[PDB]
């Protein structure tokens, strides 16, 4: 059989193969044929965590697997190869989910992105169009086939994740601006376009798509059909338009309907020519604005909706809200306009099913902590495992090792339940504290590791009578010891050497 001991393995060869590998094969050489026999051992590796020990020569002489038994987990946690008598906390146990469910509304139509991204004409910046999109399945991967732009520019989300989220309403605004005024279509911008023609809010959640259109909006004589506002009494509020045309007055005297002194027309026409520089060529801009989930959702991508399961630790995806938990029936009285339910920590715990108007309650799956009770490794290798604060009827668990319950190895205390210890009626002094009036110890010989109830002290009863006294007739001199700490170590710490070292840039950065 394979020999006992340790012998580390050293690499030779690494190659950039970069192909699928699923199966392998071993070749043999046959002389000529002639009979032959071969033997070989094959094992499968798994993702594990090991604790390896290096001796003074630099060679690996020992290793401990961290998922074989509670003692090895304790050794890995303590980062030591020896464990002293006591009770330690090693890890936690959780229940893994079984399957996944997805619930999306009854949406069949396709969103009309074709009629927005090219219509042979775009409205002026001072009076920009606006189209509302709702009740359709949104496919944002086809937008690239309609306009010759380079890339998106999204602020609240990412362009590649737009096929998963499910919104309430979508809005599309389209116009034509100058080349160097594209940078003004952004939150917190100031300029002629920003505060007089088109203003974006400071908390924008959407995308901007701008592309050059010099081959359609330019004429040799000069395009004069695109106008913009120049004068205005006050700045614009977010998402507001102005259409009114009048004679702006820059003087005290009234204009009286004539563009005379201190009287102008606040509608200047762009001059577009094909011989202009890049910064002056016309640019077509379309802004998509998303509304987050507050009302029933109406717009989102093509995700299939699966079956609904209950009373199982399962993964859920309700209208882009993803999580894991146990879904049960609800006694909550949701109002017609409500769709979610929140708790003290501000996390969702009651949801409404998009397809059938029904309310479900979410509870996190069972979990808890594990403690390992062991005597010193110098004594024995046996341990007991205490699941803390769990009715011992619950016990795909997170820990790799699994426990098997026999008749008498499982005990239930007021601090959880204990696996691997035998209960006795005797009462000794406490050895390894466990919980409320329970202790554990190691027997001479799960038969080992007994768990009992601690004993307060030896029983006594002094005879009392109202005409009797007890007087001593001898003495004893005793000498006892008492140990008290007085002082501790005096240390000093240097900042610059500890934080930066001999570096000069780090010290300059730290100086401020």
């Amino acid at each position: 059989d394979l020999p006992q001991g340790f012998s580390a393995l050293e690499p030779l060869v690494d190659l950039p193969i970069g192909i699928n590998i699923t199966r392998f094969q071993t070749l043999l050489a046959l002389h000529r044929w002639t009979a032959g026999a071969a033997a070989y051992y094959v094992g499968y590796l798994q993702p594990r965590t090991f604790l390896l020990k290096y001796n003074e020569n630099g060679t690996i002489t020992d290793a401990v697997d961290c998922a074989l038994d509670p003692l090895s987990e304790t050794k890995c946690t303590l980062k030591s190869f020896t464990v002293e008598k006591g009770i330690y906390q090693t890890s936690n146990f959780r229940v893994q989910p079984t399957e996944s469910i997805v619930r999306f509304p009854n949406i069949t139509n396709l969103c009309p992105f074709h009629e927005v991204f090219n219509a042979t004409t775009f409205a002026s910046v001072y009076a920009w169009n606006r189209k509302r999109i709702s009740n359709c399945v949104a496919d944002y991967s086809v937008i690239y086939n309609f306009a010759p732009f380079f890339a998106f520019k999204c602020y609240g989300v990412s362009p590649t994740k737009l096929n998963d989220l499910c919104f309430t309403n979508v809005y599309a605004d389209s116009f034509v601006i100058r080349g160097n005024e594209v940078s003004q279509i952004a939150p917190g911008q100031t300029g002629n376009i920003a505060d007089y023609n088109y203003k974006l809010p400071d908390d924008f959640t959407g995308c901007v798509i701008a592309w050059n259109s010099n081959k359609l909006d330019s004429k040799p004589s000069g395009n004069y059909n695109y106008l913009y506002r120049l004068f205005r009494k006050s700045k614009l509020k977010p998402f507001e338009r102005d259409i009114s045309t009048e004679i702006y007055q820059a003087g005290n005297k009234p204009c009286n309907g004539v563009a005379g002194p201190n009287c102008y027309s606040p509608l200047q026409s762009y001059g577009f020519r094909p011989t202009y520089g890049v910064g002056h060529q016309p640019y077509r801009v379309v802004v998509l604005s998303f509304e987050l989930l507050h009302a029933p959702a109406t717009v989102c991508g093509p995700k299939k909706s699966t079956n609904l399961v209950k009373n199982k630790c399962v993964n859920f995806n309700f209208n882009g809200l993803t999580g894991t938990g146990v879904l049960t029936e609800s006694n909550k009285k949701f109002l017609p306009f409500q769709q979610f339910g929140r708790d003290i920590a501000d996390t969702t715990d009651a949801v409404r099913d998009p397809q059938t108007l029904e309310i479900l309650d979410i509870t996190p799956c069972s979990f808890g902590g594990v403690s390992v009770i062991t005597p010193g490794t110098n004594t024995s290798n046996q341990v007991a495992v205490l699941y803390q604060g769990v009715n011992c009827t619950e016990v795909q668990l997170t820990p790799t090792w699994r426990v098997y319950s026999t008749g008498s190895n499982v005990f239930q205390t007021r601090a959880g339940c204990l696996i691997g210890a035998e209960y006795v009626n005797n009462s000794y002094e406490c050895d390894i504290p466990i919980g409320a009036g329970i202790c554990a110890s190691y027997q001479t010989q799960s038969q080992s590791i007994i768990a009992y109830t601690m004993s307060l002290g030896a029983e006594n009863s002094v005879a009392y009578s109202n005409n009797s006294i007890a007087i001593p007739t001898n003495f004893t001199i005793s000498v006892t010891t008492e140990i008290l700490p007085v002082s501790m170590t005096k240390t000093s710490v240097d900042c610059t050497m500890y934080i930066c070292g001999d570096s000069t840039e780090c010290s300059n950065l730290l100086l401020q």
Partner: nanobody, 114 residues
């Protein structure tokens, strides 16, 4: 779910042979120990045979030269080959295995007629 189950007990005349087949539900390559105990009525249990992970095998005084203990790797099981039965071998037999916590079998009755 139960760790170990034994089967093979019954009525056998003196001088015969029998086979006990304590089968485990976990890979026996990490159990580190398989032990056989026998309890006869009126007395306590006494050690019979012991096999450890490495391969060393041990028996008590009333075992050597009579019956042996082995194990195969095709099926998780430990076999005891009772031979040369006599009167006091009538007992209930249990198998025990400890990896980090002792697991005990149910036990089976073995009776020899003399």
């Amino acid at each position: 779910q139960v760790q170990l189950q034994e089967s093979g007990g019954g009525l056998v005349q003196a001088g015969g042979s029998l086979r006990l087949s304590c089968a485990a539900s976990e890979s026996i390559f990490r159990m580190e120990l398989m032990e056989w105990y026998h309890q006869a009525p009126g007395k306590q249990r006494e050690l019979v045979a012991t096999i450890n992970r490495c391969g060393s095998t041990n028996y008590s005084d009333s075992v050597k030269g009579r019956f042996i203990i082995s194990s195969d790797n095709a099926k998780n099981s430990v076999y005891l080959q009772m031979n040369s039965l006599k009167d006091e071998d009538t007992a209930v037999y249990s198998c025990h295995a400890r990896t980090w916590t002792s697991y005990w079998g149910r036990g089976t009755q073995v009776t020899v007629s003399s």
